[model samples]
Target: DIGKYFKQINTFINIDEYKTIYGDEIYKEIYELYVERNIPEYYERKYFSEDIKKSVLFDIDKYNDVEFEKAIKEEFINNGVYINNIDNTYYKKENILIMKKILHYFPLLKLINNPSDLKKLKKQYLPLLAHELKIFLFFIVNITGGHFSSVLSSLEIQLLLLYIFNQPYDNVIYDIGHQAYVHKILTGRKLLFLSLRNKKGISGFLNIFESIYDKFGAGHSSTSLSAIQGYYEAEWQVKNKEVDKVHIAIIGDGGLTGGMALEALNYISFLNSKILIIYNDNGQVSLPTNAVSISGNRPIGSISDHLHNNIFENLNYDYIGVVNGNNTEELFKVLNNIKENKLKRATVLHVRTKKSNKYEDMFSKETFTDIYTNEMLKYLKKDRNIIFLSPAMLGGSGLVKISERYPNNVYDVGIAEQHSVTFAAAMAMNKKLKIQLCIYSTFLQRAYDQIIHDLNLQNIPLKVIIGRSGLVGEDGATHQGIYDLSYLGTLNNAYIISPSNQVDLKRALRFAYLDKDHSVYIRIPRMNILSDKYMKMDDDNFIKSFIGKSRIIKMTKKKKVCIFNMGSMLFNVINAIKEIEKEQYISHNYSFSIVDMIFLNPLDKNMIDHVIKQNKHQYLITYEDNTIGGFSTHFNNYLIENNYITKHNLYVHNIYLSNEPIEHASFKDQQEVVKMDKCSLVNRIKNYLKNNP
Candidate 1:
């Protein structure tokens, strides 16, 4: 039955696949029934949803682009000409180097200082443009979590959009803001580019409300063409003043790979609205598509063995290219010709380009895979069959080195998160060895059903190592990793392990691999480890001692507050406790008992029971980084049901991210927004004492 379900269809699937066999909306019935059958009813929600109070970016706004200026100064010096900066602009031998090297990664850096030499300008000035653009992206990375490589590819295209396109008259739709950074820089936002995704500054993606030139706001991929078609239709309806203005959907090759982009191509076949679908086909957007796709597209919807550039013709559209995607001069040549010719119908122009290509120290934010992978490496030594699979996020997830070492054993399924999970499940069907899947927490939501039905139902020991968990700042709402805990908690027999430090993380990883009774899903919040002894394991003999246990790190006589902390939130607790300890001028004393909770599901109340049996804390607080359906709720309910902790007696404050779609900002800002930062957490503890004590 499963084998038959693996039918591949890029083209229209024969109706026989579901229509004939199921008959009369049975497929719809099956869909509703399947989800209901698997997911727990209580955890299901229709929708879900940060502030700064000590942010890594506290001085970022106050910080200037002096480093960028220094780099530009060096570039000018290297060119045998000294330079000076005035009002954040550069000049070299009485020339501006800012606009140079914007060729969208055109044939690398050359010595063309003069624009009169078109090819030289194309080569040399291109690198010059990229140098500034790279420096600009460096600032964006400081506040906004954006792709440097993706932005690198779009630098030239950014110039093309601002320089060539008749903005305010012609319509330009960016599929994603891969090139939007350069557009911002070139279009009078140079002075303000550092504030790209800041709370008070410009948006990361194109925003229509911000300017007339920005026709539509493009965030997720494979969407620009559809919006561009709508604009063309609107203009045709009204006797618009401008008739010759062109509407272009500037998209990446990966965005075109999306099914929706293909559907838009299908919808545009009958339109005579001269929309230019600029498929900037430089290939894969990113490795995981999380930072990349974890998912995107197909070859323009499985085009039949046609020439690479001519596949758009299948949809009855004019097509040109597979052209070298750099060089603005070359683009102008083709684009101007296409415009002058005034072709009636959608046109696809493909361009190929070469691409140019870590804040790990922060205690509040960093990937935890660095620790688990070490344990994974140790386990892999004993069993060569422990296959590692990632949805093209090896570079970020800390599995690149392991993948390189175990080349045959490791597989990178590009941008397809759901497929990766299903495939991993299939791989584990035989029980040959463990299948450890490493994916970002935000993207992991995409593969929820597979995790439940494929792995959880069958009881497979598939280890899911989730990175980018907790408040993923800068990338904003769509990319925030606040949903994994609630989602995975809903699955049956899903063992959730979260370790605060490397030692315990390694211990948990080893235990999860060895313990094959339940499916293991490790939720690693994006936080750094302080030290090996930051938090102790459940017990020295933890392997046999506890199953659903919470590890108690400290219990005190005062016991003003009992803080129940998960992995990522532990850093905040550690910071908060240290502040309290210092505020009272003590070495290690505190009015708080810190419990480093390692497990979420099958929650053993042994530690909580023992603590209650000894002393009852006035404030029972769950300091976690999740929104709802979180571990605190689990801990609270378990304690109450066991008849130990009470609601009125204990002021159980649930310190988590607020129930709202958090805007992308500095991580500290996000934490302060929810009042989960060290200051916020410390304040919460202080308030508990002030009122209750």
Candidate 2:
């Protein structure tokens, strides 16, 4: 009976002729097999119970005729499908199916398909994939304990694009790493591995080291488009290879709320590269959708729409859409068309999809996906009298938890990262409040100007828990928290610590929360660290207490090369020190505390003089993050300014992402590609020491 249905559909659609011409029945066979294998299970578990075969047959019958297509289209339009109509098609479900069928009719539709059909396809499939992925991710997240709503929304677009491109099990990257679940499923990653989020077995985002399919990894957003452009350009120009492939980027609208996407868009438009930028407009950030309801006293659906008339158009992109994103047929058609046509300009497909689609409870409660909850508050109470900090509102869960336990102490200033830092300085000004300023590392840059002008100027005591630092995989360059240490290290009166594990993070948070007068920054990793053991130190002494206070991870009685490291790269620094020490004895100091003079502007005269005096130490190396205005630059300037000429070799190396947008991949893979990994850092440090020594 099931076979008969497939045969009828094949005959009706002329799929048998397609199989005959293609000289392979495999595709059709696989399609049927997949349906036969999976559809029955899906129906029995969710849609059918009375008689599994009968119920499935009945549903299949509904899809057998054109009437079902009409119903689908009507449903899409009635659902507020388009927020901005570039072309007034307003395609419904059946239209979406028709477009897909047209695409199926012409595989070249990837190049020569109609724009309307392409837009409709993107609209329909994007929402359907997003909704389906959201359901799967809901269970995955609950068990794994990771970010919720945004990840769900991201997964939808990621899956749709991958499916549309027929992405090879290789050559895929996720900007800002959070949206790798759908990729995981398509790549044959089992659901059982879903519990791994920053764990040993699983990653929170894509990892090249984990799989070949992930060409690049991301832990942040807005990077997909730019990264894909590079990947496409490199293949087309640099490598001078002619290949038939689709370079795709599925980015979140929330990420566009920042500046990186715009910058990338400008670059791509100039190059007029063949890359697909899928904008997943879910209308929310880590907090509620900041969609503006009023503009100049008039109502507007979103501030973005009001300030910029069609964001992509202003960027000089071949813009399309505002379609029903929840229908699969529409999505398939739109993507197929885009793939068919080789546009003269960069293309942007803006599809409006819900953040918590079909999740009535999350939608109704307004707690879509964030760390805020009454239950989490219970945990903060256990550590009463301690300040809790978090970056952005993050739905106020972390702050709420702390405040509910310690009333009047927990504070949240709306999206003001710089202000949060300064406010913490004021709190630290007093010994009572015990300041804990939680903020994302990327956003923490906003406060760098403030940290130098306000907090560091007065030598105020402040503690910051910088979240989402390191190689934030999926959200892309703007969201990656990699530069905090390099920039923050430039500030005077600041102590930076990067914890490698949750235990270390908890301890560091506890330590930072309680300290006074001394400004402390605890850099949190964007991905989870599987280690359970926490490393403790009894020495709370500042780096200024010792000469050249870099942490000494290794020592050898025979060698005299020293490597200095700061921030998340501390682990790498330590590992490098061990490797170097294996060859020879080296003196190293882990500056777990503040350093005098180095805390404020350029390393104070005293610190510079001290380093110069150690000219006999064979090799001197410095590792930090801030690139141009970073620590190494300041140190180099100091050496040059002092005119300290000696036979001693001095090497300054700082690890940071390229100024250009970083592609998505695992934190480890990204670090390696960027030469920020422990092994890579060690190699570079060794080579530098050898050349200068």
Candidate 3:
């Protein structure tokens, strides 16, 4: 079946290797596919057993699709990929989801014939390309489990931009999040595109390192104009700078509310700057209301409905595009006019787009954050004095219903991360009221100054329910919840406690209601919960004993080597521990201990010292999802300064996120990129044992 496994010439192995592994049948089948009736994997979807099953996770099948598809989609939609047509039906059945998707874009299947010539390619290929991409995305999403709507929604815009800026001198930059998928694919990544968002595969967003056509990198929103500003201000070595090149910044409507995005628009108030901004207004960023509807298959936003008037006109830029963002010819004509015969001043194309326009049903996912939300209210309902606040992420943070249920108790300050902290700090100062700032880990990093100045300095009990705290797969680096440990744990007044599962998160929520003089940050990742064997180690008592205390998740099955982790890192650390134990453990051999050091601050010097002193022969390995400042450095520093180890008896080798920026990748691969997955420690153990052996 090796020959049968070789459906893709795009695969890494050669045919001879397949025959060597699987017998003559593979060679015959491979030859048949290659020479006789060669067809792309599109026609042979059911043939891929190994690939079709691989989920970034080794035993992804453990998470049965029928069991997990709906819940995961719901969790994701609750906190991510908010395109229009948001509903819960598409993810209910795996085959039906793919079938409906394939049926919708079924017409473009003829494009495999390579429909038509180059000049009229824009008109002919585009319609085919858009719909073709829709079906292709369907397969990829089924294969890779990625965000399909984002790519399909912005396909027309991406194609239009490609048509206009198909030159070396012209550069295009996309805003962060799912809006960049089309840009990544069109910019010469179509060949290996199937691996999109796969662990160790192609990134999900625009990576400047990936290609030159990707002029700037982004994963977080509202930074494109500033990137363009720098490009414009850069002192080029060659003369005739103005006539030689053009720069384009493609920012979406959701990006406009980000503080920096508005600041950039304000900065471009003068006519002297020669830059163009394509305000890709996809109207996807929405506010909390019990209402739902899309004007043109796109959500309604602050800047979305006001197409009749120009917001940029007052700022001294030519405002165009109350037109259809998807129209290829219309877009080509408008862009051509702008470049060739349009006015010389700075320009803004206020293009209105419906993100993932065709695959809206795929994004219409449903979530029962109400489980967590109701648990939160269970605690708040215990006290009439509690209040909730979110920075425009009321929906994402699962606080939307708190506004509906406790009308006067909830408030959402629009995308102002910095202000949300100071404002919440003020609420915390009130003796009778308990404050809850439910925010995402990445966005919470934006309020570091306010945390340091307003909260930590004047310490108060501000309960921070941090959602989306770890590797949010496809969302990429800007959105990775990597820095909270460094920023939050470093503060003097912060008390960090992370829940390993739903029961634990509920416990933390229950604990938050108690009046205290310190701040608490509860970290929860995009989606959580693992198998019973891996998780039964953490109990209700573990969370009950949480604040400022560490719990032993697994005890000395290994007399040597302890892997210490915090929050989301605990999951992967445990994952690695099990893999190593299964592969290398001997009945008489040492099985490593796993400790969940939930709180990053307030060192349990006595407790840690006891562990190191007891396991004098064991080497310690500390790992975290955060950069260098995570548990590794803190504990390593604690061990060294206090003289807790000697090389002869005990050694400490650390594992942590890479010092550089992490790009878009699966949790499993991102862990590898950052220098350690479950196997990474085993490799370190192997090296450590060579000297000891």
Candidate 1, residue 391: the lDDT equals 65
lDDT of 2 by residue, 416-511 (tens): 465567666766777655556777767777677668888878877776666666676534444666677567766657766654444445544445
Tens digits of per-residue lDDT for model 1 on 219-268? Answer: 66767888998888888777654556778888776666555676787888
C-alpha-based local distance difference test score of model 1:
0.62
Error of 1 at 593 (Å): 1.6
Residue 333 error, candidate 3, Å = 4.1
**Number of the top candidate by TM-score?**
3
For model 2, the run of ten residues with the poorest summed lDDT:
359-368
Query: What's the best-to-worst order under TM-score?
Result: 3, 1, 2
Mind giving the per-residue lDDT tens digits that candidate 3 earns over 461-557?
Answer: 7888888876665667778787777777678777776666565666666667663666888887676454444445254565446555676777644
Q: Model 2 residue 651 lDDT?
A: 41
TM-score of each: 0.70, 0.47, 0.71
